[PDB]
Amino acid sequence: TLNGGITDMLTELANFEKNVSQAIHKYNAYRKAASVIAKYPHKIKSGAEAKKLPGVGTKIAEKIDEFLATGKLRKLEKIRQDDTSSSINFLTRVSGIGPSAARKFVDEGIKTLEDLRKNEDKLNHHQRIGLKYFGDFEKRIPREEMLQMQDIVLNEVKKVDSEYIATVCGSFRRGAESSGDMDVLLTHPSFTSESTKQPKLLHQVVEQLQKVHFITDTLSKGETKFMGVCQLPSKNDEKEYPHRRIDIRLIPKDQYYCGVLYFTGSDIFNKNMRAHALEKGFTINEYTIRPLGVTGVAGEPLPVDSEKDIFDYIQWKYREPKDRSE
DNA sequence: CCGACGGCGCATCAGC
DNA sequence: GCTGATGCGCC
DNA sequence: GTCGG
Ligand SMILES: [Cl-]
Ligand SMILES: [Cl-]
Ligand SMILES: [Mg+2]
Ligand code: NA
Ligand code: NA
Ligand code: NA
Which of A139, A158, A184 corresponds to the end of one domain?
A139
Q: Strand A141-142 and strand A182-187: pairing? A: unpaired
Same domain, A146 and A252: yes
Contact A248, A232 (CB under 8 A): no
Query: Which nucleotide has the shortest C1'-to-CA distance from A24?
Result: B5
Q: How was this entry determined? A: X-ray
With 0-12 / 13-18 / 19 or more C-beta atoms within 10 angstroms meaning exposed / middle / buried, residue A183 is: buried
Question: Which domain CATH number covers A131?
Answer: 1.10.150.20
Cα–Cα dist A37/A34, whole Å: 5
Cα–Cα dist A86/A83, whole Å: 5
Resolution of the PDB structure in angstroms: 1.7
Handedness of CA A61, A11, A33, A176 (dihedral sign): positive
Same domain, A192 and A181: yes
Cα–Cα dist A63/A10, whole Å: 9
Cα–Cα dist A170/A179, whole Å: 8
Question: Domain range spanning residue A102?
Answer: 83-139
Q: Is A63 a catalytic residue?
A: yes
Domain tally, chain A: 4
- Ligand 3 center–CA A125 separation, angstroms: 21
Handedness of CA A222, A282, A193, A207 (dihedral sign): negative
Question: Which domain CATH number covers A242?
Answer: 3.30.460.10
Residue among A252, A250, A232 nearest A242 (CA): A232
Cα–Cα dist A30/A26, whole Å: 6
Query: H-type helices in chain A, by residue range?
Result: 4-16, 24-39, 47-51, 58-70, 74-81, 83-91, 99-108, 113-118, 125-132, 134-137, 143-160, 201-211, 256-264, 267-280, 307-313
**DSSP code for A211:** H
Same domain, A206 and A163: yes
Q: Return the axis-axis angle of helices A24-39 and A4-16, rounded to nearest 10°.
A: 170
| Segment holding A283, helix H or strand E | strand A282-284
Cα–Cα dist A294/A290, whole Å: 13
Strand B bases contacted by the protein (CB, 7 Å): 4-12
Hey, what amino acid is at A238? E
Give how far the C-alpha of residue A72 lies from the chain's centroid of Cα atoms, to the nearest Å.
Answer: 28
Give how far the C-alpha of residue A278 lies from the chain's centroid of Cα atoms, to the nearest Å.
Answer: 22
